[PDB]
């Protein structure tokens, strides 16, 4: 199927408490594989998946060198942005950056991304053409114009279409057991009586990978979107994900209700019933 690589960077200023906190993480699909934390003792980029642990010291030294350079540009960015928005030196602020690439099911380049946020709101983003920028703020126009004049988009397009996807394909091959796998959801239902005239039916999907899943309830084959309580898909901590969906079923009506599960790991979508 299709795949992605994404790097996520967060720098948070801590006025009067030293240097900004900087955290970087890298993902292939839904699997984290590298991290850097400025507050950690090693000051190295570190492995977080088993298939990247065998990359070797040129990889680790060079990724450490580059991630530290990302930390220093964000440190400068916090000061630059404070200037742009005329903010005081006292408050804590947050810059976030994400970049990376998608490949389709043929493993060819599909899409790339490079975007920033300041204090939780979009700041600037590379458009889908990889040639132009979206900036909403007046302050972000300065950045946009600077990046146009320095030809930043051209540099990023080269990386996103070339280096990014070539290394994604390398990772996919080297981590074939971890990354080209699917884990199908293991499913069950629970039934808990609210009062005497109705009960909660909850449909569970556990131990699945990747995170993408659809869990829905129907009643007589009609979707029950409005009346279904759904929770956000959540990490189990072992590399798999969990989700549940619940409905309230009036007495005697359990056989009207079906829980439907779609997931790439299933040979066929599941239709489950309490019976």
């Amino acid at each position: 199927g299709s795949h992605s690589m994404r790097y996520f960077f967060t720098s948070v200023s801590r006025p009067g408490r030293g240097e900004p906190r900087f955290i970087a993480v890298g993902y292939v699909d839904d699997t984290q594989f590298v991290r850097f934390d400025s507050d950690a003792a090693s000051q190295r980029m570190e492995p977080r998946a088993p298939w990247i642990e065998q990359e070797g010291p040129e990889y680790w030294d060079g990724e450490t060198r580059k991630v530290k350079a990302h930390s220093q540009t964000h440190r400068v960015d916090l000061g630059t942005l404070r200037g742009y928005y005329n903010q005081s030196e006292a408050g804590s602020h947050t810059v976030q950056r994400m970049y990376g690439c998608d490949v389709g099911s043929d493993w060819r380049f599909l899409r790339g991304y490079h975007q920033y946020a300041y204090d939780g709101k979009d700041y600037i983003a590379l458009k889908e053409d990889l040639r132009s920028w979206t900036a909403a703020d007046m302050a972000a126009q300065t950045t946009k114009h600077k990046w146009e004049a320095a030809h930043v988009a051209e540099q990023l397009r080269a990386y996103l279409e070339g280096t990014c996807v070539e290394w994604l394909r390398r990772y996919l091959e080297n981590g074939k057991e971890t990354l080209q796998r699917t884990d199908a959801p293991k499913t069950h239902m629970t039934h808990h009586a609210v009062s005497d005239h109705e009960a909660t039916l909850r449909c569970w999907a556990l131990s699945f990978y990747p995170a993408e899943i659809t869990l829905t309830w129907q009643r007589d084959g009609e979707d029950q979107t409005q009346d279904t309580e759904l929770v956000e898909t959540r990490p189990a901590g072992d590399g798999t994900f969990q989700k549940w969906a619940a409905v309230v079923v009036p007495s005697g009506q359990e056989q009207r209700y079906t829980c439907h599960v779609q997931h790439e790991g299933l040979p066929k979508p599941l239709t489950l019933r309490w019976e």
Binding site: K66, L81, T163
Partner: peptide, 9 residues
């Protein structure tokens, strides 16, 4: 693999 060129806002 990370991008290798500095970018400043």
């Amino acid at each position: 693999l990370l991008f290798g060129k500095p970018v400043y806002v």
